[PDB]
Design an enzyme around this catalytic site. Structure first.
Site, mmCIF file in Angstrom:
data_model
loop_
_atom_site.group_PDB
_atom_site.id
_atom_site.type_symbol
_atom_site.label_atom_id
_atom_site.label_comp_id
_atom_site.label_asym_id
_atom_site.label_seq_id
_atom_site.Cartn_x
_atom_site.Cartn_y
_atom_site.Cartn_z
ATOM 1 N N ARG A 107 55.663 -53.104 99.781
ATOM 2 C CA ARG A 107 56.574 -53.658 98.786
ATOM 3 C C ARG A 107 57.149 -52.594 97.860
ATOM 4 O O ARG A 107 58.263 -52.762 97.355
ATOM 5 C CB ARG A 107 55.863 -54.731 97.963
HETATM 6 N N1 LIG Z 1 67.546 -57.770 101.785
HETATM 7 C C1 LIG Z 1 66.536 -56.895 101.754
HETATM 8 N N2 LIG Z 1 66.811 -55.604 101.467
HETATM 9 C C2 LIG Z 1 65.809 -54.724 101.437
HETATM 10 N N3 LIG Z 1 64.510 -54.930 101.663
HETATM 11 C C3 LIG Z 1 64.266 -56.213 101.948
HETATM 12 C C4 LIG Z 1 65.196 -57.237 102.014
HETATM 13 N N4 LIG Z 1 64.582 -58.438 102.336
HETATM 14 C C5 LIG Z 1 63.317 -58.118 102.454
HETATM 15 N N5 LIG Z 1 63.053 -56.791 102.235
HETATM 16 C C6 LIG Z 1 61.746 -56.144 102.289
HETATM 17 O O1 LIG Z 1 60.786 -57.121 102.652
HETATM 18 C C7 LIG Z 1 59.697 -57.132 101.705
HETATM 19 C C8 LIG Z 1 59.799 -58.349 100.822
HETATM 20 O O2 LIG Z 1 59.238 -58.009 99.537
HETATM 21 P P1 LIG Z 1 58.749 -59.125 98.535
HETATM 22 O O3 LIG Z 1 57.462 -58.767 97.907
HETATM 23 O O4 LIG Z 1 59.884 -59.417 97.556
HETATM 24 O O5 LIG Z 1 58.603 -60.397 99.462
HETATM 25 P P2 LIG Z 1 58.610 -61.976 99.271
HETATM 26 O O6 LIG Z 1 58.399 -62.598 100.648
HETATM 27 O O7 LIG Z 1 59.809 -62.432 98.543
HETATM 28 O O8 LIG Z 1 57.283 -62.213 98.432
HETATM 29 P P3 LIG Z 1 56.788 -62.251 96.912
HETATM 30 O O9 LIG Z 1 57.080 -63.577 96.297
HETATM 31 O O10 LIG Z 1 55.296 -61.921 96.983
HETATM 32 O O11 LIG Z 1 57.526 -61.091 96.238
HETATM 33 C C9 LIG Z 1 59.791 -55.800 100.972
HETATM 34 O O12 LIG Z 1 59.085 -54.779 101.665
HETATM 35 C C10 LIG Z 1 61.297 -55.537 100.954
HETATM 36 O O13 LIG Z 1 61.575 -54.142 100.935
#
Ligand SMILES: Nc1ncnc2c1ncn2[C@@H]1O[C@H](COP(=O)(O)OP(=O)(O)OP(=O)(O)O)[C@@H](O)[C@H]1O
Ligand SMILES: Nc1ncnc2c1ncn2[C@@H]1O[C@H](COP(=O)(O)OP(=O)(O)OP(=O)(O)O)[C@@H](O)[C@H]1O
Ligand SMILES: Nc1ncnc2c1ncn2[C@@H]1O[C@H](COP(=O)(O)OP(=O)(O)OP(=O)(O)O)[C@@H](O)[C@H]1O
Ligand SMILES: Nc1ncnc2c1ncn2[C@@H]1O[C@H](COP(=O)(O)OP(=O)(O)O)[C@@H](O)[C@H]1O
Ligand SMILES: [Mg+2]
Ligand SMILES: [Mg+2]
Ligand SMILES: [Mg+2]
Lengths: 48, 464, 516, 349, 50, 93, 348
Positions: free
Chosen positions: D326
């Site tokens: 992350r």
């Molecule tokens: N559009 C995007 N651009 C860049 N990286 C992305 C994108 N979508 C996802 N990622 C990557 O995928 C992962 C998602 O991170 P994140 O922690 O925000 O996930 P989440 O599923 O929204 O969960 P949480 O609620 O725990 O934050 C990260 O490693 C991020 O870099």
């Protein structure tokens, strides 16, 4: 009280200042109450 | 008059009172804890009556270091939090104490946390075409102004990044007040969000409140109510449009399950507490726009192990109108937004209020993707050489379309050096019509990956 | 000040008529509360399911008895409950005030006008719990209850007194079909005598208020608001309202049915009621069973859905029709409640989501749907026109599974495949567009005889529509005949053939060719 | 007092978990076959505390804090309680420093930075221990220089493992020469449930004492499912009602209380930092089990290791399709991000 | 229909002050014989003439 | 006709203010009259007299029957035994 | 003598009795409802001995308006059914009261519903061939005298006509009478069947027993026993061979599981009652032929979730001899029996 209930009835009185008048009796589960506050509240709640 | 403590276990504490002194439900109580190094002031909220002048309740602070026989005092009032214009540009915890300045904000008026949902006689549907700069949401499931918007998906799919991008794109073009509430998330995310908001001038326009997961379950169950109280106060008197964002909803249901395990109630299917639907419905009724006031709310909902059969997501789905969910298969494929068009839906998408071309394009692309999903297994096993000409053409068109829905966003700057890109609605409509007509099939595979605009597509085409 | 004079007169008449009496009754006390229930002790004799009364004005009912305790359920507001209150036994088993002024309004499940309209009148009180009509007071079912949908009445007919079930997956379109059926009867209401009139009722359980407002707006715009009523139990209410609303709706409908007027009950959802009952039972500390469900749950449904049935001419010949709606998840049918409700009723209409994804808008499955009554509830003309297209569609799909990659086929096989494809493409229909019987019969007759076999399949629907419009404009005798005799005559068939030929001679869509 | 240490006649120590109206429940830590009815119990007037000192380096101690294998005794300056409060949001700061590791794949795909928690999962016979061992050995070159701003002190914690495995790990560290700046906390399976349940908190407090002083600290947990099993056994023995999968309801909470202390302090309180690499086991690469689902949600990145890839020929056997970090590219050095970028997309495609 | 709805809105914005104009004199004349009504109520409540 | 319906709704708002005014006046005036005019002690006894008349005219009612079964039977047997065995008790016995 | 109710919950009723008047297992108790709008009389059966002169019962009618302290009398006998030659002229449920009119009374003999299967010694040691009037049935799937035959089919496949055919054939060829016992049958279908049997002039020699959905599970579980007792009386008193018809077996086990879970027992083996084999065998043991007379029966079983390893079908199939199938393709061919020879077989 002896007229309504054949058995003799003892008396134990508690003084209450909240009521504006009337009298209340409790012989157990059954209850009788005539109170100024109760009548006023009953009239008010059925106003509409 | 005061009572005593007779039993202690976990977070739940029960207390005893003399005759004619029991308080009603949901009344704050204070308790004193003393030690050489652990001195605090326990705050408790009444939960239920056990009879015989005994009341059982829960606490909002850790119960470590408490001794029986300590007196417990009552305030005869409910929890409250200060409100007003001065709340803007500050950080608060659940109890309402200002975290930035210990003494700030202790003189404004106070409101009870518990309220009543608005009456049914003042409800009116809201219909408006609110457009963002992202292709998938613009075409498949348009968002509705003054309505419910929410996400779905498992862990690590990218919902928080999408929320950050959405708020960054909208708050720059808003004249109203926004409030942010964090139910459960890592402290690093909150600190980074605060720093990022401080990097611009928008921080003075919004108010943040959040609690973390390390706290006892009492605090995790009350932050949302305080946030709703602040939002309702801003909406009711100022008569101004408001924005509300919730990081998660599963957390407080989890906290309720945890506390109801100890409270003494029997469990239910899949070990969930009874009457979870009632509490969820009671809370979700607060966010509503009346005839003269409009509030837009965006929520994110977590699911365990990518299972939609779980009762909690099924229950919380019925409270939504516009929905967009995320899938893990597309994420493992590589596409970054990871939005599955087949299952997502909207509630304003009909030719009655929208141009028919939008409807026709949406239906055509949905049919094409459905047919490709059907032919998947035969393509995988028997190979492309077995199908006919029509199937091959639809397979190629499906590959082109599936690659084309990807798009880079500004929030990806930290992860990838590619800068942001935004495209309007009409250009996307025309591009999708061109693609579904089948006049761009000569391009190679990599020319349709991570493409913002048609001119960018042409430039990449000339680059290979 | 005429209005002021009336107000003063009413106030004086009420105030001068005040009267009260001093009568004894049993009063008990609350010992504990919380989590939506409370325990009350001290009542010597109370009937089961008695409507109690609390000092704060909130209400409650008694479910569980004991040697020294009485369980209770708080219906309305709950936070006013505290130790020390005094209960008062009042009246008897709760009832509902039914009348004839309920039309065109929205009421509380207990019978209160939550709408902004003023108070309503009352005619008579009816208790919820009454025995269903016996086995010696019913007739056979024979009546053409229209539905306004081509597929539904072509495949699975519906008659008066028949309980039909709709089970669907999430986001499929059950409510759209229900609304189309509920508003299809405007022309029926417009007729004078009540022999065609039907008084319909709607029940909504566990739904957002905005959705109910939208449904009311749709019905009001449709103009069917005049002969319908709504019962609403939104999510903000306690479990009691969600548990008790369907009984109130059924009783209100049954009062109309019992006096010789046809009605139509509709239940929006039944899973929510089962969940509420499960929550109440678990909170009252009763033994659990499979899937955390009480044993008697099945019995519950049998008590509710069985009220509707056709009556005999001795009692006036009333009728009542029910359309329960069930929601299933992950295309699973082996679940407890789906199996119980399937085994308790007759006739099913499965609503797949794959079909709704592309192509058919009604998205009704054909190979699993069935109707028990069948031909006994059909119209003679459309039964003759039907021509048993079920087998045709079945062999059409069976063959077209094979013929997707096959170019060399038997000529008759190709003709059958083309006929099946044409019929499937014909059977589609948009929303908010009910159709009357005569145009449905005309369209089905056009489809069956092979008149449109020369029309390219891509643009059939539009063509069909145009024909209908033209048939409505320059011709009116065939509609009159089919309305008066309910049978298709040979001479009308010849005239329709001539009309079809002359219209098809002058229609083009894309490089078309009019042929014999 | 709640969670107060109590003395016993035989020399063993107990802890009072829950306080009833007339009875007090207690759990025994050490040998418990010399406990009978009619003994005497005394209160020490103090909450569970552990001594801390700088002499612990290069030695092995039991969870309470008494050496078992080493020679002599430990000079500890202070004793601090196990239960404390994690730093708040206002006292934190962003992360910018890199944490170099010997494996090129790890830094190439999912870089690890100071103040960031990373999670390792996989089946048996995969090779997850070697990663932590290699990192600890690789820290030696940085430790060679005496600057306090480039020194890393690491702590190893073992739960429910055979003693011979611990001896082999010690031998490997001795051969690597890192034993100068490392310590081991051992909780062999032969011990009772108390030590298995209590060791990680002792390790976390030991690390936190150095973290406050401004020195960077590395923490590695060997097993975490064993602790959950021990807690489940204790709760079931204490007549507490059960929950889903026979686990106690609040188990998730416990894990949070351990995995929130690890963070990075702000400049005002010093450059102290903490990192952790908890390890979670699994069966048949099944994520449907709720323990992995609970533990993923509170971590900043995870690495999936499959046996099929291991037998295929990929020795590290990391699955680039699912593994993700992350924090992103901010942790790695700028030259690495210039040369290497968007490689994971290429591999997945 | 939009213009007719605007005319209806004008009629509503006339009635919304029409009823207030009526209610001004209604409130002025309300308490003309309110004392008599209260006296009747009190006499009925007490059970004797006031 | 809908506008006529809102005209009736406006009349209902007049009914609302009518109800509020009537409630306020009734509460205030009746409460002051009962707590001021008949607050003299000499009236109170009179009130009691009236209530007595009601208790005189009420219809008669039947009252009967003023913890385990085996315990109740054993207690009854013990009471009977005590009654039969306490005949010769003295003042101090 | 008189007893008082103690606690009331659902249909389960607790009663208390004096020391010397404790009833035994499976008796009948009567009670009354005072309320005018819900005037009714309630019948209860004894199922457990809680001890200390407290009895837990089960009510055969819905409980509403019942009041604590109401007296309870004792019948002194088990559930009784009327038997005689005046039977098979009308329709009535388990309690025995005729639904068309209350004209029929206690004139007939009264027999207890609970009986015992015949002893081991007098069992018939040899089988016997049974012949019918259908060519395909006799040629392909022979029917064993005194056996049990299962039939699978739906509506529109000529099932009712087959039932009427068999009824008239047995009535006219070998004499005797047959009874019909619908368990958990919908009311409108029952009325249609009553009217149709009235129209076919075969209503005279058949006895109809019905079980309605609206009733609590007690009647739904006792109706089959009552009907079987009636058929046994016919067989053992008149000497006429009889045929028994059962609509479903799944609902019987469903009601058994429900009444098991309401008594607060412990579920086992996929949410089923722990002793289902005992009840199933006790019901099926009173079908075999003895003393030169036969009691042939026909059942229609429902398989849940298309699983043939489910406990209920697995236990049901253990007492099966012949299986018959019906479909639509054979009906599309256009023949009367509409039986598929490739899906039916027999064990003889
Ligand atoms: N559009 C995007 N651009 C860049 N990286 C992305 C994108 N979508 C996802 N990622 C990557 O995928 C992962 C998602 O991170 P994140 O922690 O925000 O996930 P989440 O599923 O929204 O969960 P949480 O609620 O725990 O934050 C990260 O490693 C991020 O870099
Ligand atoms: N014939 C049709 N043609 C086009 N669109 C249709 C048709 N029938 C339904 N729809 C659309 O399908 C959706 C169905 O919405 P509806 O209100 O019927 O919900 P539902 O599928 O019954 O589900 P639920 O009750 O769970 O919300 C709407 O978007 C509606 O516009
Ligand atoms: N890169 C590699 N190349 C070759 N062999 C390797 C590599 N990494 C690990 N191994 C070998 O794989 C095996 C894994 O040993 P290890 O003790 O680390 O197992 P583990 O899967 O972590 O299990 P556990 O700790 O539960 O015993 C060892 O034999 C080790 O030498
Ligand atoms: N062999 C047959 N020949 C002619 N008609 C038949 C035949 N079998 C069934 N039918 C017709 O089918 C209808 C349904 O019969 P059946 O299947 O016995 O009842 P159900 O449909 O209720 O099971 C009857 O009305 C009958 O006219
Ligand atoms: Mg996120
Ligand atoms: Mg719907
Ligand atoms: Mg290993």
């Amino acid at each position: 009280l002896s007229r309504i209930y054949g058995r003799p009835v003892s008396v134990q009185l508690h003084v209450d200042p909240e009521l504006l008048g009337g009298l209340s009796i409790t012989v157990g589960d059954e209850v009788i109450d005539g109170s100024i506050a109760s009548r006023l509240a009953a009239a008010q709640t059925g106003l509409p | 008059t005061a009572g005593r403590v007779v039993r202690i276990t976990g977070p739940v504490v029960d207390v005893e009172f003399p005759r004619g002194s029991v308080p009603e439900l949901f009344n704050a109580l204070h308790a004193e804890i003393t030690f050489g190094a652990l001195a605090k002031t326990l705050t408790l909220e009444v939960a239920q009556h056990l009879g015989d002048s005994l009341v059982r309740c829960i606490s909002m602070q850790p119960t470590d270091g408490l001794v029986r026989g300590v007196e417990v005092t009552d305030t005869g009032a409910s929890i409250s939090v200060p409100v007003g214009d001065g709340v803007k540009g500050h950080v608060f915890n659940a109890l309402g104490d200002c975290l930035d300045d210990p003494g700030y904000g202790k003189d404004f008026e106070h409101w009870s946390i518990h309220r009543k949902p608005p009456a049914f006689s003042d409800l009116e549907p809201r219909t408006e075409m609110l457009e963002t700069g992202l292709k998938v949401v613009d075409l498949l499931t348009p968002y509705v102004r003054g309505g419910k918007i929410a996400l779905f998906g498992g862990a690590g799919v990218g919902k928080t990044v999408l929320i950050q991008e959405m708020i960054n794109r909208i708050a720059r073009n808003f004249g109203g007040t926004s409030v942010f509430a964090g139910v459960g998330e890592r402290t690093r995310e909150g600190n980074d969000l605060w720093v990022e908001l401080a990097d611009a001038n928008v921080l003075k326009d919004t108010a943040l409140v959040f609690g973390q997961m390390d706290e006892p379950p009492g605090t995790r169950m009350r932050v949302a109510l305080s946030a709703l109280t602040m939002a309702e106060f801003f909406r009711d008197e100022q008569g101004q449009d408001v924005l509300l964002f919730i990081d998660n909803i599963f957390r407080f249901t989890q906290a309720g399950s945890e506390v109801s395990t100890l409270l003494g109630r029997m469990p239910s299917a899949v070990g969930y507490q009874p009457t979870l639907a009632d509490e969820m419905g009671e809370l979700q009724e607060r966010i509503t726009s009346t005839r003269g006031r409009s509030i837009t709310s965006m929520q994110a909902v977590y699911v365990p192990a990518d299972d939609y059969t779980d009762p909690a997501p099924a229950t919380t789905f019925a409270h939504l109108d516009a929905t967009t969910e995320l899938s893990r298969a597309v994420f493992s494929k590589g596409i970054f937004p990871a939005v599955d068009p087949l299952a997502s839906s909207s509630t304003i998408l009909d030719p009655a209020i929208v141009g028919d071309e939008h409807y026709r394009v949406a239906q055509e692309v949905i049919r094409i993707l459905q047919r490709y999903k059907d032919l998947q297994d035969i393509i995988a096993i028997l190979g492309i050489d077995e199908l006919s000409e029509e199937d091959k053409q639809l397979v190629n068109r499906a590959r082109r379309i599936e690659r084309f829905l990807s798009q880079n966003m500004m929030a990806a700057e930290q992860f990838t050096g590619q800068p942001g890109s935004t495209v309007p609605l009409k250009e996307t409509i025309e591009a999708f019509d061109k693609l579904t007509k089948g006049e761009f099939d000569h391009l190679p595979e990599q020319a349709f990956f991570l493409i913002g605009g048609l001119d960018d597509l042409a430039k990449k085409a000339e680059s290979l | 000040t005429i209005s002021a004079a009336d107000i003063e007169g009413a106030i004086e008449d009420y105030v001068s008529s005040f009267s009260a009496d001093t009568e004894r009754e049993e009063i008990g006390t609350v010992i504990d509360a919380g989590d939506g229930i409370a325990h009350v002790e001290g009542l010597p004799s109370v009937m089961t399911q008695e409507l109690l009364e609390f000092p704060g004005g909130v209400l409650g009912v008694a479910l569980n008895l004991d040697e020294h305790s009485v369980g209770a359920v708080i219906l309305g507001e709950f936070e006013k409950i505290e130790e020390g209150q005094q209960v008062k036994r009042t009246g008897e088993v709760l009832s509902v005030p039914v009348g004839d002024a309920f039309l065109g309004r929205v009421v509380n499940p207990l019978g209160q006008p939550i709408d902004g309209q003023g108070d309503i009148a009352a005619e008579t009180r009816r208790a919820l719990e009454l025995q269903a009509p016996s086995v010696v007071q019913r007739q056979s079912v024979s009546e053409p209850l229209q539905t306004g949908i081509k597929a539904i009445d072509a495949m699975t007919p519906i008659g008066r007194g028949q309980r039909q079930l709709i089970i669907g997956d999430r986001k499929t379109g059950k409510t759209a079909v229900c609304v189309d059926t509920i508003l299809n009867q405007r022309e029926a209401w417009l007729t004078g005598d009540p022999k065609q009139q039907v008084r319909c009722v709607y029940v909504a359980i566990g739904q957002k208020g905005t959705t109910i407002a939208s449904v009311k707006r749709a019905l009001e715009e449709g103009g069917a608001m005049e002969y319908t009523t709504i019962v609403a139990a939104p999510a903000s209410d306690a479990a009691g309202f969600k548990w008790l609303a369907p009984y109130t709706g059924s009783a209100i409908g049954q009062h109309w049915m019992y006096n010789g007027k046809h009605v139509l009950i509709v239940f929006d959802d039944l899973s929510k009621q089962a969940d509420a009952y499960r929550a109440i039972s678990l909170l009252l500390r009763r033994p659990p069973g499979r899937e955390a469900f009480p044993g008697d749950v099945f019995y519950l449904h049998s008590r509710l859905l069985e009220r509707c049935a056709k009556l005999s001419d001795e009692l006036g010949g009333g009728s009542m029709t029910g359309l329960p709606i069930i929601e299933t998840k992950a295309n699973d049918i082996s679940a407890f409640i789906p199996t119980n409700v399937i085994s308790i009723t007759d006739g099913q209409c499965f609503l797949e989501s794959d079909l709704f994804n592309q192509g058919v808008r009604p998205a009704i499955n054909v190979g699993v749907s069935v109707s028990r009554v069948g031909g006994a509830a059909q119209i003679k003309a459309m039964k003759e026109v039907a021509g048993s297209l079920r087998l045709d569609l079945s062999q059409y799909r069976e063959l077209e599974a094979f013929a997707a990659f096959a170019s060399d086929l038997d000529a008759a096989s190709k003709a059958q495949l083309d006929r099946g494809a044409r019929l499937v493409e014909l059977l589609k229909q948009p929303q908010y567009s009910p159709l009357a019987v005569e145009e449905q019969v005309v369209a089905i007759f056009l489809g069956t005889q092979g008149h449109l076999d020369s029309v390219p399949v891509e643009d059939v629907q539009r063509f069909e529509s145009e024909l209908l419009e033209h048939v409505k404009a320059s011709h009116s005798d065939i509609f009159d005949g089919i309305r008066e005799t309910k049978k298709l005559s040979e001479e009308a068939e010849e005239k329709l053939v001539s009309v079809i030929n002359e219209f098809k001679k002058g229609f083009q869509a894309s490089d078309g060719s009019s042929v014999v | 007092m709640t969670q107060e240490l109590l003395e016993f006649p035989g020399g063993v120590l107990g802890v009072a978990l829950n306080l009833d109206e007339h009875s007090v429940g207690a759990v025994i830590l050490g040998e418990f076959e010399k406990i009978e009815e009619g003994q005497q119990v005394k209160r020490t007037g103090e909450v569970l505390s552990v001594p801390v000192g700088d002499a612990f380096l290069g030695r092995v101690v039991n969870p309470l804090g008494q050496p078992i294998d080493g020679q002599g005794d430990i000079a500890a300056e202070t004793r601090r309680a196990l239960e404390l409060q994690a730093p708040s949001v206002v006292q934190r700061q962003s992360v910018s420093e890199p944490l170099q590791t010997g494996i090129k794949a790890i830094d190439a795909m999912t870089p690890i930075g100071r103040g960031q928690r990373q999670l390792i999962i996989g089946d048996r016979k995969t090779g997850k221990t070697a990663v932590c061992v290699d990192t600890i050995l690789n820290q030696r070159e940085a430790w060679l220089t005496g600057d306090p701003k480039q020194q890393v002190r690491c702590v190893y914690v073992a739960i429910g493992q055979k003693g011979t495995t611990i001896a082999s790990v010690k031998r490997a560290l001795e051969e690597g020469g890192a034993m100068e700046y490392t310590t081991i906390v051992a909780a062999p399976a032969s011990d009772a449930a108390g030590f298995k349940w209590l060791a990680p908190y002792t390790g976390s407090a030991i690390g936190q004492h150095w973290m406050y002083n401004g020195k960077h600290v590395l923490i590695v947990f060997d097993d975490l499912s064993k602790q959950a099993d021990a807690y489940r056994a204790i709760s079931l023995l204490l007549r507490r009602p059960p929950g889903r999968e026979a686990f106690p309801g609040d188990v998730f909470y416990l894990h949070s209380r351990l995995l929130e202390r690890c963070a990075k302090l702000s400049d005002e309180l010093g450059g102290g930092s903490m990192t952790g690499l908890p390890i979670i086991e699994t069966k048949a690469n099944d994520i449907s089990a709720f323990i992995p689902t609970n533990v993923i949600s509170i971590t900043d990145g995870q690495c999936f290791l499959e046996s099929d890839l291991f037998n295929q020929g990929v020795r590290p056997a990391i699955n680039v399709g699912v593994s993700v970090s992350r924090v992103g590219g901010a942790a790695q050095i700028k030259a690495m991000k210039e040369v290497a970028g968007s490689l994971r997309l290429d591999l997945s495609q | 229909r939009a213009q007719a709805s605007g005319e209806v809105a004008q009629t509503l914005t006339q009635a919304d002050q029409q009823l207030s104009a009526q209610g001004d004199q209604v409130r002025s004349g309300l308490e003309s014989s309110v004392d008599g009504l209260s006296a009747k109520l009190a006499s009925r409540i007490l059970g004797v003439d006031v | 006709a809908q506008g006529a319906q809102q005209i009736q709704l406006m009349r209902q708002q007049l009914i609302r203010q009518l109800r509020t005014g009537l409630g306020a006046e009734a509460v205030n005036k009746a409460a002051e009259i009962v707590r001021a005019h008949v607050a003299d002690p000499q009236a109170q006894s009179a009130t009691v007299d009236r209530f007595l008349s009601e208790l005189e005219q009420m219809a008669p009612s039947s009252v009967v029957i003023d913890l385990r079964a085996a315990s109740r039977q054993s207690l009854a047997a013990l009471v009977e035994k005590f009654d039969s065995v306490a005949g010769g008790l003295d003042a101090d016995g």
